[PDB]
Symmetry: D2
């Protein structure tokens, strides 16, 4: 019934927009349609393997990884709606050549879950969008706002299906890519997380590194003091994959700070913030254990943050723990 496109134009309808969210969100979707198409044949298309570079916070790039990044860069650029761009894959913020400038700052991870791709696990793209608040001719700093300054954010999941999750001030709506007519059709609106979940999602290979709170927490899920059944475990390795399952089934997802990394592994700008925004607009929470992610004022574009997101009841149970040990 309702295409993605219709939905934004209608929303913008009564928000009395000028509509350059619309071009922008429309310029994104095609990329999403392009990334995904390639991914589904990434094997015959000889894309699995590596290009040859280390990402800014130290990851090994793959041909795909560049492909989608360029593409997204290009379509945002030509959308006429963005002035500053931040990407997984570039040292430095991209500024947009004035003829094409717009009021928008789009942070993004073009293809997250790098590990997963050879083993054909689900992969996704992540974005977050802010309004420039500045008189100042546009600069890198226009990206350094807290997550609470988002006007729109979500992600694409190239799983068993392709899906576009979008969060906007009004709430969360999922669309699913129809491969046949290549159009994003709306499958769930306006989504909400369970108050409490049955699943826990973390890499326990760092058991030796976790702090006492995470350690106590994880053990509470395996040995419930109430004697209820213990949460199931699930950890795919693709953040977008897990977030999503957390989102639809409820429960928790944790990429906590370990001993090794003061602030966790996941990038604040284009990974942690978007997912938190969604989570909060779905009615869940997103904490580091100490602060709301959404409130952190970034200083480095490429900066990391520990992240705990999920059904609030669960996210609180932990916070409570962290507080107990504070």
């Amino acid at each position: 019934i309702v295409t993605l496109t219709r939905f934004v134009m209608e929303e913008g309808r009564k928000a009395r927009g000028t509509g350059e969210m619309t071009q922008l969100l429309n310029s994104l979707c095609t990329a999403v349609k392009a990334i995904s198409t390639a991914v589904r044949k990434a094997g015959i298309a000889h894309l699995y393997g590596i290009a040859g570079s280390t990402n800014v916070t130290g990851d090994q790039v793959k041909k795909l990884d560049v492909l989608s990044n360029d593409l997204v860069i290009n379509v945002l650029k030509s959308s006429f709606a963005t002035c500053v761009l931040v990407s997984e894959e570039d040292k430095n913020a991209i500024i947009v050549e004035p003829e094409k400038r717009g009021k928008y700052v789009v942070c993004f991870d073009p293809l997250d879950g790098s590990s997963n791709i050879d083993c054909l696990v689900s992969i996704g793209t992540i974005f977050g969008i802010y309004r420039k608040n500045s008189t100042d001719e546009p600069s890198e700093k226009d990206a350094l706002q807290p997550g609470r300054n988002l006007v729109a954010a979500g992600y694409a999941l190239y799983g068993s299906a392709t899906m576009l999750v979008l969060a906007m001030v009004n709430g969360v709506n999922c669309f699913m890519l129809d491969p046949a007519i290549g159009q994003f059709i709306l499958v769930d609106r306006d989504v909400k997380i369970k108050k409490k979940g049955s699943i826990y999602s973390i890499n326990e290979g760092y058991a030796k590194e976790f702090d006492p709170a995470i350690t106590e927490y994880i053990q509470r899920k395996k040995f419930p003091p109430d004697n209820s059944a213990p949460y199931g475990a699930r950890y795919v390795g693709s953040m977008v994959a897990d977030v999503h399952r957390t989102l639809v089934y409820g429960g928790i997802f944790m990429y906590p700070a370990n001993k090794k990394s003061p602030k966790g592994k996941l990038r604040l700008l284009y990974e942690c913030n978007p997912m938190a925004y969604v989570m909060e607009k779905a009615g869940g929470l997103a904490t580091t254990g100490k602060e709301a992610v959404l409130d952190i004022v970034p200083t480095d574009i490429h900066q990391r943050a520990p992240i705990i997101l999920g059904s609030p009841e669960d996210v609180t149970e932990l916070l409570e723990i962290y507080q107990k040990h504070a």
Copy 2:
């Protein structure tokens, strides 16, 4: 270059076959092409949710689950190459009406990873093929052979891509579904597992239930006595998804017997055996901790078995443990 179809005809070429493996494997592939197509649009196609029944060893069925089962049943039937069929989803072995009979017994899980489908995690189909050894007019018992009596087995993965993994006496070759021309094109031959892995794959939500061996083992991966780095964890929830990653990256996958279930959860006939066969033909191992899976003589079609499969070095490390506690 080489279609799936070419590959089997060529293999059968020098094996001096009559060729009804070929029809049979060809009658499978289309189903695989049909299951997958549907899965990628399972949302617009209103397939997510439930039909209304409990599978034989107690699972909740979904519309999809039936769809693919019928389809596979139908295409095997019409292949002219099979006499007895065993399915996840039927109490009783299917016998084939004589005009359509063949020398083949095909066990199979039409769509495994039931949980995953709503959250768009990877899903797959699993099969194993035996030759009837019997004068006797065909019966259910023709399925009760050990796994070592397999002539062919593998699985389909509807992940970020669609992939057909096939194991035959000669070894393991992966094909990848080209969505465009709808043909299974060959991506890896003839595959082999690492002697040793870096990843561990189990549901630790049953920590309280595991036996001491699994318990000691899991802890060895988190706290290496050698002081090496601890294995990463990964558990998607779809056996085919994990097996595959284990297969391509190496490491271990465990669905061990717990306190609750004497023999684990995974069905011997159409889940455990195929994956073991592949694993062994890839050069890995597949144990219960006490016996080779391949050697177990089944008595109940629908029977379960604990299963530990993977890079041999890892699979042995555990066996050694289990032996220590024997």
Copy 3:
């Protein structure tokens, strides 16, 4: 490189639009993507045959015919950019419910070449767009403008490929539907017809009915007085199919008035006008033999007109004839 969508937004960029051409043209394209998808499987989709009705100027409807009509009606409606709609398939002009009204009047033949569909010949969709010029609350009459009052017009060809031909004041640009990513990509801009052609395109089954001018003309192509080689003949039966070939190869297309029908067979509003507009914006001509089609002021929405369009040199040769006999 350039999507259809980009192209219109850019054009509208410097035309200083409000942009509701854009939604409108974007709301069209999806239909085009939807009509076409269905057509390519119209056989397995059991769409070939008939629904059960006679179109306003006396044609037999087919399930498809309705399908695409509804769809186009729906997407234009929801575009927010149109007040009055005229369709092959409705007695009466459609007015749009005010909340959804726009400044646009779109005439259209949802699926032309009805005959062709069972035999899998090329089929197409045709449209023309006018601006309402009226204070008056919108009515049927808003459609009765001459063709010269068009702001945009073109057609879709579901041939061996799918193609979107668009004519706008600035000229003619062809896009081709990429089945893979389902996006209209630009293949030719900004198109032009040969001054003179080598092909003639008419139904000679009405030889007995044609007027002396057409009769003399057709014979001149078969027996050139200059002793040059005689034009090749080509007549597919789908106007959009022939127009297009005329457009790319050059030459002439004729659906002249016969003895039987004072004014030919082809509908002025949503067949003759669009094709003339394109033809003129491609630099060709479009005559009845007596008047420019573009200048005819219509009185009946569903009214017909004889039409002769093509490379001008050829279109003139005829006019000259018609004049000689005037």
Copy 4:
């Protein structure tokens, strides 16, 4: 329900075959799936234009033209079922390297309707299959049998849909390519032509060249002596396109010998014969005006023949004429 593949295996079922028709017909279909995929995006895929060569009886080649030819050559080769191949596009018969030899001689036009492709008119592939009758180690001459020596023949139509028409001793069955699952599904069996048609299909641009019979005939369709309505005309320019329409709607198709070319334009081996075979197995006729096409014993592989095929009532009306003038 029934895939193409099922259908041949079943037919071969009771014909007590060894089954290498089956591989062969299966090795064809994929090509058909490959040719077609490319054609639908021949524009974005930059395939429209020319490679640079003149075909054996004097046609200008295009990149596509080679592409599909190679492909078909390759898949037939690897089918293991063919010893001698004849193609539009090669001076000389192809012999097959013994390891891959089969009992089959396949004549074929890889992509017919060359003209049409830029204007996106329908295009097709044409084939005919004979059994080698020779002790003699295989040579070019194995192709020089009359059309009556065909075991199987038909064509592919990349029209608005993709369609596989197949004629076998038993009759005519049409399958239609499902783009989605990329499988040839059966749409009509076992087809038959009208005893009499309402349409005539010829290039009247050669009016000046036609013989008196064709001339009188064409005029009879425009001026019926019975005073019935005159046949409609239709001529697309792609033989496969017209044949097909003739096949489904009935009527006549003519590529008669003209003054200029003693024997017409269409190649006997891989154009005229297949279409005649189909026509006769559909219950229609296929004449030169003097002889059955099927009975002509060829001497040159690349040789042409005039061809008149269609509903028999119509095809006879003409013969009668030709006889009257004999």
